[PDB]
Amino acid sequence: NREEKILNREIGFAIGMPVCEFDMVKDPEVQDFRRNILNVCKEAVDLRDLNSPHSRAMYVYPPNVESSPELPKHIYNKLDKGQIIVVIWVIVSPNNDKQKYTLKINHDCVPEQVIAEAIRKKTRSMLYQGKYILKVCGCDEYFLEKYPLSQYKYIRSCIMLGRMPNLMLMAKESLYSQLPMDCFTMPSYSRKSLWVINSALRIKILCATYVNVNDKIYVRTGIYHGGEPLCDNVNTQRVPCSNPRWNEWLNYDIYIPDLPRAARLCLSICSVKEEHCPLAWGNINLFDYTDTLVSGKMALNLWPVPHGLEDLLNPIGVTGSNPNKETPCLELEFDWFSSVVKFPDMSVIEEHANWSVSREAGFSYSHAGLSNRLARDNELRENDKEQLKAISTRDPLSEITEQEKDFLWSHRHYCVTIPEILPKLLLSVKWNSRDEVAQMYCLVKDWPPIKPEQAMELLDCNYPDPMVRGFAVRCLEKYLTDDKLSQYLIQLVQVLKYEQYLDNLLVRFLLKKALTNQRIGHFFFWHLKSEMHNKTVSQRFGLLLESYCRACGMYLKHLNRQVEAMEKLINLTDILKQEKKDETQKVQMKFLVEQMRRPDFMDALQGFLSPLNPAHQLGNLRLEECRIMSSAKRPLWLNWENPDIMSELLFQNNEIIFKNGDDLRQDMLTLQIIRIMENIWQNQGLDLRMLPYGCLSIGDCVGLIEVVRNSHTIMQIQCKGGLKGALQFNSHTLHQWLKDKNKGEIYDAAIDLFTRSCAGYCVATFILGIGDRHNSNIMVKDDGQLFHIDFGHFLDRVPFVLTQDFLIVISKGTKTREFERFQEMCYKAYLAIRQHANLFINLFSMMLGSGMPELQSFDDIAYIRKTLALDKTEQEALEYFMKQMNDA
Numbered sequence: 001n002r003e004e005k006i007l008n009r010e011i012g013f014a015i016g017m018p019v020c021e022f023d024m025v026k027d028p029e030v031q032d033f034r035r036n037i038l039n040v041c042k043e044a045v046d047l048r049d050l051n052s053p054h055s056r057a058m059y060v061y062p063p064n065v066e067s068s069p070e071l072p073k074h075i076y077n078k079l080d081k082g083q084i085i086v087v088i089w090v091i092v093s094p095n096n097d098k099q100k101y102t103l104k105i106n107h108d109c110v111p112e113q114v115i116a117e118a119i120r121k122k123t124r125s126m127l128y129q130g131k132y133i134l135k136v137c138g139c140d141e142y143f144l145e146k147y148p149l150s151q152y153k154y155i156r157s158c159i160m161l162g163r164m165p166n167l168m169l170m171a172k173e174s175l176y177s178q179l180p181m182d183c184f185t186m187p188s189y190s191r192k193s194l195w196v197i198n199s200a201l202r203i204k205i206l207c208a209t210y211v212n213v214n215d216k217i218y219v220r221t222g223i224y225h226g227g228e229p230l231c232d233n234v235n236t237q238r239v240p241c242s243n244p245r246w247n248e249w250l251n252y253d254i255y256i257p258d259l260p261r262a263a264r265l266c267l268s269i270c271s272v273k274e275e276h277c278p279l280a281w282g283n284i285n286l287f288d289y290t291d292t293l294v295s296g297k298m299a300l301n302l303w304p305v306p307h308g309l310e311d312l313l314n315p316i317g318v319t320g321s322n323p324n325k326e327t328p329c330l331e332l333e334f335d336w337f338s339s340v341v342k343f344p345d346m347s348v349i350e351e352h353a354n355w356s357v358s359r360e361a362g363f364s365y366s367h368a369g370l371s372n373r374l375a376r377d378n379e380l381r382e383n384d385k386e387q388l389k390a391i392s393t394r395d396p397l398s399e400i401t402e403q404e405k406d407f408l409w410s411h412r413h414y415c416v417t418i419p420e421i422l423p424k425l426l427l428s429v430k431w432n433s434r435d436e437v438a439q440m441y442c443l444v445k446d447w448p449p450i451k452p453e454q455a456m457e458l459l460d461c462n463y464p465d466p467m468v469r470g471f472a473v474r475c476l477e478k479y480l481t482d483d484k485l486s487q488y489l490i491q492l493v494q495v496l497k498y499e500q501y502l503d504n505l506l507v508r509f510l511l512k513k514a515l516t517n518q519r520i521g522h523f524f525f526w527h528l529k530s531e532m533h534n535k536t537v538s539q540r541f542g543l544l545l546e547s548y549c550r551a552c553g554m555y556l557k558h559l560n561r562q563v564e565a566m567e568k569l570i571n572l573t574d575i576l577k578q579e580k581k582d583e584t585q586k587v588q589m590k591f592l593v594e595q596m597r598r599p600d601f602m603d604a605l606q607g608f609l610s611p612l613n614p615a616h617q618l619g620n621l622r623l624e625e626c627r628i629m630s631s632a633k634r635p636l637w638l639n640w641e642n643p644d645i646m647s648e649l650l651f652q653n654n655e656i657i658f659k660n661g662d663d664l665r666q667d668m669l670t671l672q673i674i675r676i677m678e679n680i681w682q683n684q685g686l687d688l689r690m691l692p693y694g695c696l697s698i699g700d701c702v703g704l705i706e707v708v709r710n711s712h713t714i715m716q717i718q719c720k721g722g723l724k725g726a727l728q729f730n731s732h733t734l735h736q737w738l739k740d741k742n743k744g745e746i747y748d749a750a751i752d753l754f755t756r757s758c759a760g761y762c763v764a765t766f767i768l769g770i771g772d773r774h775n776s777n778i779m780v781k782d783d784g785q786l787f788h789i790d791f792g793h794f795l796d797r798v799p800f801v802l803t804q805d806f807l808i809v810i811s812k813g814t815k816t817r818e819f820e821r822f823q824e825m826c827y828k829a830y831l832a833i834r835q836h837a838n839l840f841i842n843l844f845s846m847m848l849g850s851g852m853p854e855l856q857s858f859d860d861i862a863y864i865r866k867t868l869a870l871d872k873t874e875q876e877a878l879e880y881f882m883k884q885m886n887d888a
């Protein structure tokens, strides 16, 4: 149709590639995914239309709320007898005169209560009900739901910073008119044996093409469950890369029924010189998406070897044939049987598991042979029931011995009472045994649901099993809030890559949520779009962005404006850091102004939503304020007028830093972790103010960074311009600048705010291992709030040692009441993150599959164990932190 034609040009624009490339793809799974995922789209659209227009308004403008209405004592204590002074604005008559009405209301007041109060006071000045809604003055944020006013992030932030909440009273039909009508049109494209086999595992290696220049090459193979081998690495006989035709049948020490559903064939082509090196690699799922075992011949286009490849095989790598068909291919032949070998149904598995129970009690009572894995009845002592608890407490990176692993499996039936031990129990299973596995599948079909956070440990590279993964999705479906979903969106988008198939529960959960919450959808899109260049994931994400773009609605137009501006900034910075790179800053600027003033560049970058917070409108550009920065890689400091009619109550101007050349994934994770550390601290009752400024990677080493208003680097303060020098840098200079900025009842707050942000960042940088910190890495705001920029490296010793310049601001002139109070905060902060060690390990663990340099192995994540002192007791760790900290 005409509608469809127009749409695929639009989807194609936002996705980076045209829709018709997906049309021409002939792979059962791809066209099956393309079609099958449309019900999620329908489900999501129908949830939007289910309570039209309110539920549609909620989709586009979801309430931005904290996860709980409970205010920690220090947040509550800020309120005037548990009450908040709030200001309601009303735009009246033709001249759009802004009338304000200040109210003192309960912090837990519903928005509708607050509106009624504003109307009460509106009439009581001169001396309706559900016809109005509340909007945040200066940004596209609405308070459309019955949550208490304080539960909203804008209101809780206002309380904490001691800022006056300015809100605007808006007509419901004024917002409802601004809303478009959904039109999810269904696309054009939408219109045997089993476990019997008594054979061993054998696969033939025919030949390899596209291989040449420089001694002898062999094919190395392996059978894996995630990254754990289910047998021995079987290899082909060495051949020089002139005629690589082995045509030999490789035999493995696994029997066809003992193969788990998540079993993979991990192969590679290696070279020999005492010196072995991998050349090209490739992984295959031993079962397809319909659950059929691989039958016949196959041509696997292999992948280049990523630098720093520890082994000869890459089992953690992406499963499937490289899309670049002009790369080293490797033909294989697989054993044929009666017809088609499909994986047994859960019923067949249940009958075999109930047998692996009735005839296992017929193998312990009616066989003789011992296995320290046989579950014994009435032989579950309280002496070892506390031992299971002792194992369940341990961190995800804590090595579990063979003695402990055997003990756990034997007590599998008890472990249901302690559901948090599931990750330790699953790793205790012999996945190379169909008897143990069948018993486990059944325990998981009935396993009690665990917290979303614990269920995430099960969604990493260590747990490939579909039913283990399915349980984990069900836990996030039932217990994960939309707020916590926004927090872990980075790791959740990442774990998609580990999934064996295009169509899974994780993707359906994530897409549904993305298509039911435009805020979740926004970052979901950008997180996927930022990885389209990566040809390892480009397909999966390309299909996902298609299904998203079809059912996202009129927001696709808003995404296209963002994509167009982002490309013009890339193209501009491309020409600049190529044609004018070694030239002077005055020349680069001369060129920048000349180029930005072009008609096509002007309108692509004016009047669009900011990708950093889509609720922020970016109007006209303040070119007089747009400059190339003095900082490294030459970032582009951009300024935009805020077109909001009440911009003067939030920020008249919006400033974004456009970086082209540096990887921002590391800075993104650090700031996600910082934000999580801050929440842990705030809930726990410690007010360590952190500044997790917005950072978003938008492509291959391109990205955006939120400009922190009224802030300067440590160097900028220490100089006062350049009237001092690196030697002449007097230690008291920092405190003096702060003193001149804040005087009177203002000064005491400033020092407090400094010491607090100081204590938080000391603890944060130490745990995380954020090293190479200096005067151009640390920053301070006008109000004394400290923060850190450019997270160069992490995990690779005191990562941030206390400089005199800071301790002096902490007091005035090492042995002060302020330093004693300070030291305490750091000890208190350290102990709080230690109580959450299991979360941070998992969050980091889910990132190994992301192509990050300083997060490749479980040897990088182990650093968190050393800085948090997990092995030691809580009081023992304090002695460790005390020792590392007591060093000046």
Ligand SMILES: COc1cc(Nc2cncc(-c3ccc(C(N)=O)cc3)n2)cc(OC)c1OC
Pocket: 629, 630, 631, 657, 667, 693, 705, 706, 707, 708, 709, 711, 713, 716, 776, 789, 790, 791
């Ligand atoms: C770093 O130097 C400067 C910074 C800023 N301002 C701001 C405000 N909020 C944030 C940042 C920031 C954050 C992260 C990263 C990163 N990830 O690289 C880089 C910069 N920068 C202003 C400067 O001169 C006026 C300046 O040059 C001396």
